[PDB]
Design a protein around this ligand. Structure first.
Ligand SMILES: [Br-]
Ligand SMILES: [Br-]
Ligand SMILES: [Br-]
Ligand SMILES: [Br-]
Ligand SMILES: [Br-]
Lengths: 205, 205
């Protein structure tokens, strides 16, 4: 038997590893395959049974074919390379961001969210590691998961948060654990879902 | 009017950012989209017109519609967490490798290279970041791009090479720039291809 979990691309550089450790401790002979896909493909994988669980960040596309349980919120920060021309400057004006290249993460142009584009020109990539590498080369600025800074403490030396966004709503993902309602859940999947639901604190009666 | 380059999943941690910088200095208005995909899907994208260029490793089934030029070799290192039980020892024995879970990267079970499985049990993931995270949780050992230690010097402090592989031939990728013979290439793609080919040093007459 095996358990395949699809982590939507945008959530790769997030915190899913705790769930894998839980599963591995409880099922020491289980084969756990961690794969990644656009959210659109992730959902189809749940429908045709190639994945048993998905980590996703948007309920908008969810029909009732899907069931889910809320997980943690993941924080993202707008950053720029400290050696970028705009970085010498004490602060980046909102005109300067309007005129600088933004590196955006999205599965395709179609899935680009306009309220999150702040520059007139942008490049699109489908994962935060690619975005991060290009920002590091001074090719632009963009929004990265705070977790990346935990994974790689040298990034603080090389990247700088953009203060100009301090009076703007924070960038974040709300992460759900999603499965197919029609599926017959395996023991490991049921263990994890039950674990997450049971660990939530409920109001006193 | 835009250039989409697909980097196959296995190569996300290589020096592909050099090629992007060359493109952007020469075409300051070009939209460059860096996407990633399984090697099988990437060839399909070249044929579809989804992508103009692909960074690929050794293709299993050659197609006459593809054309390529060789780029770097990328070195891989077999590693284990410094906090894994086996790491305390001076050396890990062949038997111990055989009995510890290997974290392997491949687009699916069938594209696993059986010559690179050294353990009875393994987990499959589709990219090296995911593999790295799990190795850092002591869930197994596995092979990672040497470049990941350059991107993140921290890993030097958390992982160690397994010298039990010292008498084994080194793990590497042969990386090719690939395009479609039938697709016609924009100016940006042609410029990169020509640049690669003409930068090669040629033997004296
Ligand atoms: Br088990
Ligand atoms: Br700033
Ligand atoms: Br241009
Ligand atoms: Br591997
Ligand atoms: Br060793």
């Amino acid at each position: 038997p095996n358990l395949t979990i699809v982590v939507v691309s945008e959530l790769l550089h997030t915190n899913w590893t705790d769930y894998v450790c839980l599963l591995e401790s409880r099922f020491p002979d289980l084969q756990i395959n961690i794969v990644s896909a656009p959210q659109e493909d992730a959902l189809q994988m749940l429908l045709d049974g190639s994945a048993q669980l998905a980590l996703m960040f948007e309920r908008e596309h969810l029909d009732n074919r899907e069931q889910f349980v809320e997980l943690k919120r993941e924080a993202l920060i707008p950053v720029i390379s400290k050696t970028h021309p705009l970085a010498s400057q004490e602060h980046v004006s909102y005109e300067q961001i309007l005129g600088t290249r933004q590196i955006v993460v999205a599965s395709r142009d179609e899935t680009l969210k306009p309220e999150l584009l702040f520059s007139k020109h942008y490049w699109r990539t489908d994962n935060h590691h690619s975005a991060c590498l290009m920002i590091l080369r001074n090719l632009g600025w963009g929004v990265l998961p705070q977790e990346m800074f935990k994974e790689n403490p040298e990034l603080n030396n090389k990247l700088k948060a953009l203060d100009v966004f301090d009076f703007t709503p924070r960038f974040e993902y709300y992460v759900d654990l999603v499965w197919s309602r029609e599926s017959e859940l395996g023991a490991a999947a049921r263990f994890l879902i039950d674990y997450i639901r049971n660990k939530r604190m409920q109001p006193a009666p």
